Amino acid sequence: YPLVLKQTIPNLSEYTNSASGPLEGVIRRDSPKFKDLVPNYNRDILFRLMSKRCKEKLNVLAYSVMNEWPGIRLLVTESWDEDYHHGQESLHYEGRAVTIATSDRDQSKYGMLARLAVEAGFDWVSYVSRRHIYCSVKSD
Amino acid sequence: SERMNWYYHVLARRPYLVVVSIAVYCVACIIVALVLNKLPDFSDPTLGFETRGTKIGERLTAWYNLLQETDHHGALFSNPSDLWESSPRKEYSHFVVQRINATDSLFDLNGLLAMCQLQDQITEVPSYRAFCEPEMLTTECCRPWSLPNYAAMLANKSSCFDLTTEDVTSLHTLLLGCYEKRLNIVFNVLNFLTDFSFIVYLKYAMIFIPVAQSNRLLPLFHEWEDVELINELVEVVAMDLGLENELFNELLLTDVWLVSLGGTFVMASVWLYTGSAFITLMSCVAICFSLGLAYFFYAIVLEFEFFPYMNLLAVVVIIGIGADDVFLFLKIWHCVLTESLENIMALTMRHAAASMFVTSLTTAGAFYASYSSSITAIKCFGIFAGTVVVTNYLLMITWLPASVSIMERLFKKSINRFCQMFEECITKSIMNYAYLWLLIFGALGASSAVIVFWYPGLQLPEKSHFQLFVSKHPFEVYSSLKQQFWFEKPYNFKMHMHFVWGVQAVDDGDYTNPNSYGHLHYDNNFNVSSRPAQLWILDFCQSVRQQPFYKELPNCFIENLIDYMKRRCIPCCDAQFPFEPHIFEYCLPQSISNMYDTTFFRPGVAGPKFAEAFTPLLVKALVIEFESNVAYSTIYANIRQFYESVEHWFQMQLKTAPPELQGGWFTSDLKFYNVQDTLSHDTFVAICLAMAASLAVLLCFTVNILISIYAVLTVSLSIFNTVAVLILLGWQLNILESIAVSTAIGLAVDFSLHYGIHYRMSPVKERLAATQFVLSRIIGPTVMAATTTGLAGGIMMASNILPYIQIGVFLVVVMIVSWFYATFFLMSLLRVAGPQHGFLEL
Ligand SMILES: *[C@@H]1O[C@H](CO)[C@@H](O[C@@H]2O[C@H](CO)[C@@H](O)[C@H](O)[C@H]2NC(C)=O)[C@H](O)[C@H]1NC(C)=O
Ligand SMILES: *[C@@H]1O[C@H](CO)[C@@H](O)[C@H](O)[C@H]1NC(C)=O
């Protein structure tokens, strides 16, 4: 019920066409794809730029979290990347991936957080570290 | 045939034009579907295993997709206000173990320090350190909550020092004294560990590891594939790990290379059949080219995407067919030589036409008509095939006579001795012994008849798991072990049926890829308010309370409603059941968000589903729960009758409702059952398809009828016995085998047909005489063709897979045995009973 470190949901390649899929290119301020990116001014969350599907899943997750945690809230540790920190490939480069943690930053918590992630309707998850979890979404 | 004669002549004339131009067309379409289309890959096989287009397809589809349509988006939403404004578990990998000398309860010490060894052998791996996850922030490899660890742990020693001699004893004492002191849980933990098989004489041991369960440990899968870990007393007997569909791919990758092998086998056989290994090159590359060609037909032309690997088998299928016209042809060549070039070619070709044409035609006819199935990979398979077949057909027809001409324009003894002797001794073994083989065969024929049909029917599987490998595999060792244990159970999840109204029910998914389902509609003869309909609601709810399979809080929502209603004021207060529609849906969602935010908060499904049409509300549609007197099983007829009578009464009430309310339907997990019915139905269907097909052809050519009769019977009993052969090795039913069956027809037919033809074609009208002609002039190439087929089949066998080795079986049996069948049985039949002197011709 609470996720576990290194778990991958589904137990596949995250790019499996139905889990998250393969990347479709980086987004930079010049690329017209940035025309469609959205920042999350959702003040129940802590930062913002990400995808409309990432938006969907983020906001359906946000308050199920608070139902999971009073006093602790949706903290976005890493939403969108343009300064080349997520390797030669990342959905952070197109505002779809999210490295994620609670507003309280407590390790053994995330296992259950990731759980409600899927319970919100996310497409791919992993307790990919104690420092953070990873979540991702299909091509819109 | 005039222009046809000119055409034969052009073949006589100007080869390299076509040679090169067709090479061109090939590489063209080849690289087109190569590059434009991507290389389809298989994360897993469990694909297209639905049956869309079924009534149940409508049902499951609207159901699933509506459900993925519920509340995560859309105005469809749960609460009408939500509109408005370190102990282990299966999730860690694990091993199944045992002791294999004295065969005793593992409760003893000998096996304990045997373990100590095995453990220090186990976690000793550095690649393990890779995924070790040394927890505690200590770089300390998080400890195994294991048995000698348990022991030295409630000891104050280090594991393996546990000093069983009395430790073991007092413990077992705790265990019987155990049943639900309570030191932390170790009791109940190691309850999870093993099975009911101790109250003694636990058969197995079992490992957990504080480690991840994924596809990520492949390297370590290998690295323990290297090491047995079974030193003296033991066996790591069933290792349960999620790395399956990966090995799947890799081993297909192994076996294709292994397959080019039997390819080269048949290549050599042919070359030596002529000592011209120029033509062997011609043939093999024609093969691979027709392959790529039909590919481009597949991915690029009708532009298809989903390439179920099972279609791979066409390869080890086609390999047996492409080699027959070969020896069919060479023989005519050598003979007519024994009796300019253009006309000689034209004749021998007038003489091969029927053979090659008809053969390929029946085969690809079966494969094609595979398409009438209710299934995905099936149509994939049949379509792919039919193309590949028809390719090789034209390939030889045209590519090849050039092979001949040019091999010429260029321009041991033991073996002719041998083949001479062969035909001779055979001819005699015939001419001398008349009904021996006949009666023997008829006996065994009706034998396999009773074999298959009466007593040992082809009973189906109910444990599905759709096993993959050798039924002996550690992964498959674990296939049986589960429910013996604790952490295994759904007490059983009783059949929880559900019913719906307010949506339509179809699936406009693209019937080919398993990722196309469409968009769900809405059934709107369905007034969510009208009293007469309301009152049928409530008599309906009444009606199930009366059933035994009625098996017994949002259920029958109306109750919480009228509670909130009759619940007096301080609009929605102190009210009865039949009443307004607008005031109704006006007070309802309030009572509903009420029951929601209450501590009831039943995580549930049956009931309403909302929309903003306060802002205006409504329900789009809504549903009802019920439990069953029955729970989970993979058996057939129990669930069958269950659904049957259930739905029956469903109607019995439905029609009673105001047609306002007959917009609904009924759910369960029959899909399994959906298969276990529709599979056989559609199978038999297609069987009869290809049957009637080959029937039409036989009546087309060998016009006299006795001929096709006797052939039909030969090959039907071949069918019977090959099937009951599968029986002698004792299969459960799956699609694969329905498929190979279907093909059997266009497979076996050709032998019998060549025979009946040559004889109908002979200039003689007597049993023995025309018979002997056809002998001399038909015999061998048949044998060579079935021979290549057996080569390919039988060589898939000492391999890893159900599919491939299964298939080699299918091949070898069917081909060889249908051969013997029409190769002596019918031989006798018309040894004595041929139509002579214009007898029974059309
Ligand atoms: C079902 O039928 C009823 C009546 O035929 C519909 O409702 C009435 O119409 C509106 C509804 O908001 C209101 O004026 C009253 O509640 C009813 N009319 C009166 C009292 O004159 C109702 O909307 C229909 N529901 C659906 C889903 O079609
Ligand atoms: C350590 O030894 C004491 C004394 O026998 C025992 O009570 C205790 O259970 C041992 N350790 C553990 C972890 O149980």
From Swiss-Prot, chain A:
Binding site for Ca(2+) 1: 77-78
Domain of life assignment: Eukaryota
Protein name as annotated: Protein hedgehog N-product
Record's comment on post-translational modification: Cholesterylation is required for N-product targeting to lipid rafts and multimerization.
Function statement: The dually lipidated hedgehog protein N-product is a morphogen which is essential for a variety of patterning events during development. Establishes the anterior-posterior axis of the embryonic segments and patterns the larval imaginal disks. Binds to the patched (ptc) receptor, which functions in association with smoothened (smo), to activate the transcription of target genes wingless (wg), decapentaplegic (dpp) and ptc. In the absence of hh, ptc represses the constitutive signaling activity of smo through fused (fu).
Disulphide bonds in the chain: none
Residues engaged in binding Ca(2+) 2: 78, 81, 83
Biological classification of the source: Eukaryota, Metazoa, Ecdysozoa, Arthropoda, Hexapoda
From Swiss-Prot, chain B:
Annotated transmembrane regions: 16-36, 251-271, 281-301, 312-332, 352-372, 380-400, 434-454, 695-715, 716-736, 739-759, 778-798, 807-827
Membrane topology of the entry: Multi-pass membrane protein
Sites where a glycan is attached: 101, 156, 527
Keyword Glycoprotein part of the UniProt annotation: yes
Keyword Disulfide bond set for record: no
Pfam families with a match to the protein in the record: Sterol-sensing
One GO biological process term: segment polarity determination
Major localization class: membrane
Deleted gene: phenotype: Death during embryogenesis with a strong segment-polarity phenotype.
Keyword annotations of the record: Developmental protein, Glycoprotein, Membrane, Transmembrane, Transmembrane helix
Every SSD domain range: 238-406
Gene3D superfamilies for this protein: Multidrug efflux transporter AcrB transmembrane domain (1.20.1640.10)
Alphabetical list of InterPro entries matching this protein: Dispatched_Hh_regulator, HMGCR/SNAP/NPC1-like_SSD, SSD
Protein family (similarity comment): Belongs to the dispatched family.
Biological function: Segment polarity protein which functions in hedgehog (Hh) signaling. Regulates the trafficking and the release of cholesterol-modified hedgehog protein from cells of the posterior compartment (P cells) and is hence required for the effective production of the Hh signal.
Protein name: Protein dispatched
Organism of provenance: Drosophila melanogaster
Lineage: Eukaryota, Metazoa, Ecdysozoa, Arthropoda, Hexapoda
Gene assigned in the entry: disp
